[PDB]
Design a binder for this molecule. Structure first.
Ligand SMILES: Nc1ncnc2c1ncn2[C@@H]1O[C@H](CSCC[C@H](N)C(=O)O)[C@@H](O)[C@H]1O
Length: 206
């Protein structure tokens, strides 16, 4: 998925001298890559004690300067604003519209004026009835309808196979969440390769 990574790095653009906050950072893969492209500062946040422990361990192996915090994005307080916030596969862990809105509000509160959010999530549009994504390597096992989205149980065709639950919020739910948070504008980023897929989201503060 080169164009996914390309779009992701295109969505972020130039990071030279930019402060980056990596939300749902895991062991800090993405923030670390932006550290090597000349980010002035990188901070990582994840809700998992396990992931942040492994992140700090990896930073030791790399001898990098990256700061890691255990926090829920919905109520995190770093007492600092950043040029760029990355939130790849964070928002489909939001179990409610209120939680989704909490997360966007928290992102906005940590953005410098004219700062941008770069996100990637399960396509808001996707409905099971349209067709399953076996070809893409993602098996949709169950669909539970929510007010303004769906709960999807997804099996990734791996060995062993693993089952993930996505809260797939529709475009309108996202638009309202982005609006309430006080973003100036945003757009959906959906690349098309020549010779089911996840969607990018870029949001700019005034
Ligand atoms: N409310 C929340 N706040 C912060 N991190 C969260 C969260 N809910 C889930 N996460 C974290 O989100 C991560 C998703 S997997 C890692 C995603 C990573 N940004 C990437 O693109 O590769 C998990 O590590 C999980 O612990």
């Amino acid at each position: 998925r080169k164009v996914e990574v390309r779009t992701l790095f295109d969505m972020v653009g130039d990071v030279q001298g930019k402060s980056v906050l990596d939300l749902a950072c895991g062991y800090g893969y993405f923030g670390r890559e932006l550290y090597h492209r000349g980010a002035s500062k990188v901070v990582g946040v994840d809700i998992s004690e396990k992931m942040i422990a492994l992140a700090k361990k990896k930073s030791t192996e790399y001898g990098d300067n990256i700061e890691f915090h255990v926090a829920n994005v919905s109520d995190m307080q770093l007492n600092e604003k950043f040029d760029i916030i990355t939130a790849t596969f964070l928002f489909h862990y939001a179990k409610s519209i209120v939680e989704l809105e909490s997360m966007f509000r928290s992102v906005a509160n940590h953005l410098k004026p004219s700062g941008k959010l770069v996100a990637y999530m399960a396509a808001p549009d996707y409905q099971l009835e349209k067709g399953n994504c076996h070809n893409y390597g993602l098996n949709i096992l169950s669909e539970e309808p929510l007010q303004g989205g769906f709960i999807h149980q997804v099996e990734f065709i791996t060995t062993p196979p693993i089952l993930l639950t996505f809260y797939r919020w529709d475009r309108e739910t996202y638009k309202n969440a982005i609006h309430k948070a006080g973003f100036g504008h945003f757009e959906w980023r959906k690349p098309m390769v020549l010779e089911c897929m996840h969607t990018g989201l870029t949001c700019w503060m005034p």
